[PDB]
Write a protein that binds this DNA or RNA. Sequence first.
RNA 1: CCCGCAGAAGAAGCACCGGCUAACUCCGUGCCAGCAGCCGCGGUAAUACGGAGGGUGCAAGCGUUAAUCGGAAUUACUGGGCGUAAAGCGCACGCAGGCGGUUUGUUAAGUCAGAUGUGAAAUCCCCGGGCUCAACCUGGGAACUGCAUCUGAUACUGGCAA
RNA 2: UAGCUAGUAGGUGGGGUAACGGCUCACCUAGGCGACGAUCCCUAGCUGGUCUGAGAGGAUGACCAGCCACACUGGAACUGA
Lengths: 129, 80, 150, 82, 71, 123, 205
Amino acid sequence: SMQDPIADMLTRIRNGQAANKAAVTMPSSKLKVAIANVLKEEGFIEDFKVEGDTKPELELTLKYFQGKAVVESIQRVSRPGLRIYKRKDELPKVMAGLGIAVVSTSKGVMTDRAARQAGLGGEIICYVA
Amino acid sequence: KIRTLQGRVVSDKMEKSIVVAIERFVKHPIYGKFIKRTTKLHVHDENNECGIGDVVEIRECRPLSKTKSWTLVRVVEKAV
Amino acid sequence: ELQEKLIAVNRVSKTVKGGRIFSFTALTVVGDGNGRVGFGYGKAREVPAAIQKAMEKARRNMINVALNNGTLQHPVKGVHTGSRVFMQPASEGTGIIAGGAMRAVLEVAGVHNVLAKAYGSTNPINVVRATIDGLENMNSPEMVAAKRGK
Amino acid sequence: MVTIRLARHGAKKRPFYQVVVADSRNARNGRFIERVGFFNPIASEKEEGTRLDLDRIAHWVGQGATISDRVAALIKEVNKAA
Amino acid sequence: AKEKDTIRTEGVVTEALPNATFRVKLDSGPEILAYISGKMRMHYIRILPGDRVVVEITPYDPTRGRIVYRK
Amino acid sequence: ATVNQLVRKPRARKVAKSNVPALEACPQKRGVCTRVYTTTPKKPNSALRKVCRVRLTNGFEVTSYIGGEGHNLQEHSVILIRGGRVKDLPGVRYHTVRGALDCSGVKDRKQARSKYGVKRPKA
Amino acid sequence: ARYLGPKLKLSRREGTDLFLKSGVRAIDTKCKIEQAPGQHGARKPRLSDYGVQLREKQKVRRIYGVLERQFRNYYKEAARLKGNTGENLLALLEGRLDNVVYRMGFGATRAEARQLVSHKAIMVNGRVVNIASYQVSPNDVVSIREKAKKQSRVKAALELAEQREKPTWLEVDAGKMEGTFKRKPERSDLSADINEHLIVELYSK
RNA sequence: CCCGCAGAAGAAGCACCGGCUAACUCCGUGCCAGCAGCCGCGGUAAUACGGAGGGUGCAAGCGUUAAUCGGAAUUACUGGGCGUAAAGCGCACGCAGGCGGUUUGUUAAGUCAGAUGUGAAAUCCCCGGGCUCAACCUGGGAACUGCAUCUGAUACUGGCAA
RNA sequence: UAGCUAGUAGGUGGGGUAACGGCUCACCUAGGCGACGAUCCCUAGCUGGUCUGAGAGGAUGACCAGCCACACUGGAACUGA
């Protein structure tokens, strides 16, 4: 059995962008939507959508710059077997600010840029290149 | 206010004597894993009324005999 | 005109029925000091012929690389074969601190300060192209602005 | 017992004293409670060179500390005003 | 630079060991271990016991000869 | 390797043994010696090269190269013994210091007198 | 301390003049530039990438007349300071006392300038200063004292001093044997001979 | 510490120069003598040995040796591998241990925020000051990546309930 | 080096110490510690630090300063804050 659906969601993104597909599906949850909202805020994905009731199903519309994918890469930085926490001072920056991280703070799911402006830290999830 | 800890018995019982294993969480500094540390303490009690496997609040006191320098205060849901 | 130079020359034998016979393999890098980086790997029966044939091939195979002040836009990694090349921009002052083979390919692009180090294999032929792949993928604020947001 | 006294950390043939609160048993260079000033006898033409926080020294005198004869002289030198 | 204090004298080859090493009995001296010289190896020449060869000996170690001259 | 495994059993550095049993954080040692041979090298080279069996003062018997052109050394003689392998010979990891204790310097040597133990020519 | 050897050999080895002699005349005949010193210097060098770095270290060091250990101390100070290290290097070298005496033109040569500061002719802000390596400040007057005033040594120097192009960071004065150091050199003020990233690069490995 | 006197007078050596690695020819010896950190040189024209001339590096030091770290991502947390190169137990079930779908409530342990106490001084670091300058000495600040207690936040993980 | 512990583990009472205490005694109960490495062996004074390293780390604890231990070998007490 799979042990992280979040790294699964990131894997479905980089496989979809590489294969040049439009719609990518997975079973929905709150943090999956909240991460996809950060992706649409920064601009990487086109749109999120959810459809269902007994099993809600998140449908992520991917995005293409040209024939080239918008997302360069995406990696799971904190992982189930090894948890990484970043304090307010220690908040990292992805590729000299050109990328973003995803960070779960006390005040919710932010970027590293938004968490520096908010003035608090927490568990970093992934580096969006 | 006093400082205090919470642990669980998981131990045999003797005359006015109970041991309390206190589990805690520490980040392991070389590899960054969060690892469960076990702090076992001998404890003084109110006429050994506690069970086994339940969760007990605990606090420091004078030595009452070898290593028995803690005393219990309150118990959540005694025995099972 | 553009800046041209050579990295190294290496002798190679075919080895045939009548005995050994020795070719010469050169490796060359060119650049305009404003990106426009290009390289050429050539070979010949004698040495002064080999570097000319390499520099001829160096004119085409020419790639455009982002540059600001005297350095790279952001930290970049690149790999080719066994050779792993890391680098960071290290803005203002500083000078160039960089590996063998790497230093020639790095300089002709037009950086004047930069940090770089070769992991893995340091064989010149695979240290080259690992570099060009790292320089080619490199982004800019303009490039990200084109595909998303501000 | 506590004593206010001059300890020498400066270079050879150029003493730079550190006036300091310490117990009497401990060696001159040794263990101490707190620093309170400095005294440069070699000095230079600059204004700074004798310094002592009087709120600290009057506190330690209030706790009963006694004063070494040089520090006693330097206190009655600097006073409120010299 | 080299000094000419090494001594050359004859002997009969008693027995061939491994490694192109030979047990040579001198005329005056004892039986000494002698290795073949470079020149014989260079011109692909091999030798055999019972034959009488010139054998260079050093004063430093008198147990090690050197087979200088041909069969 | 897996991170739980590295918590369980950590990484372990190599022992990093020295080339010289003379050791003891010492650059120089002393010995009384016995025998001076002139042994052949390995077959890619040829020569007869001057080698000595040094009994060290710490009780170790070792073998040692004699550099320079000839020497006075024989029998019971006290020499100084520094490190350094000679790979062309078998197992020699040491060198005798010329111009020290009982050892002669190299007479009529003119260059590189830091080695070979030779005070400067004056005329 | 000091090089002490033949001056022209260093200029001939480096292949560009280092101004070490150069009093009465900038003579071509003596120098024999780009022919190299010694027997086999006639041949083309075909120099290495390590060697062009090592040559440039010697080229800069031989101008100011420094030794490697003292020169290393300037590199360590120039490195810890904010901004470009090569520029902060050349600033500390130009900030030497024996160098300012050459710039003001009180001495004919850098060796004669070091001789005059060693021989206690030179005073800075009314202190006498023995040490050649001494670091001059902004706002520093400098002057010759009475014993060394109006000798054949200074008098011949002040004549040949007029030929020079004249520094931009100091006031020359010198109508009464003094000078004033106004402000720091910067990269534009100082010469274009030095390759500044290159000399710094060699210490990196 | 300062002044005076005399006169270039009293004061430069050491390693290295085949490639790596900055810096070359001749003579002697002839796989001998010997050099060699590594790959290697020398068997009659040795840029590698010995000597001389020339050259290069560094300086009252220079070189060798021993000792430690670096280069070494060559024990790889950051930062490595395991088809054929060293490397997946012969295979399976399983306790201790690691990790865990999805929804809500709650707790605030982990975690994150703030404050206080403490983190000796010397050191290290920065800005200044004083010894002819520097080394050295020294003023103040920052640093001391830490830990404990208290007050907050509740996204995430853990505890607890459905 | 995988089992090790009888004052060993706990209680009551007596004695003892400046004072808590199996500290030391009598009696009673049968526990204690143990793979988050007990016990045993080898080796080692520890730390603020030094040295190296881009950092993480590694090696190391001379000098300076804090603390402990030892004073020919082995054992004990007196005097005294």
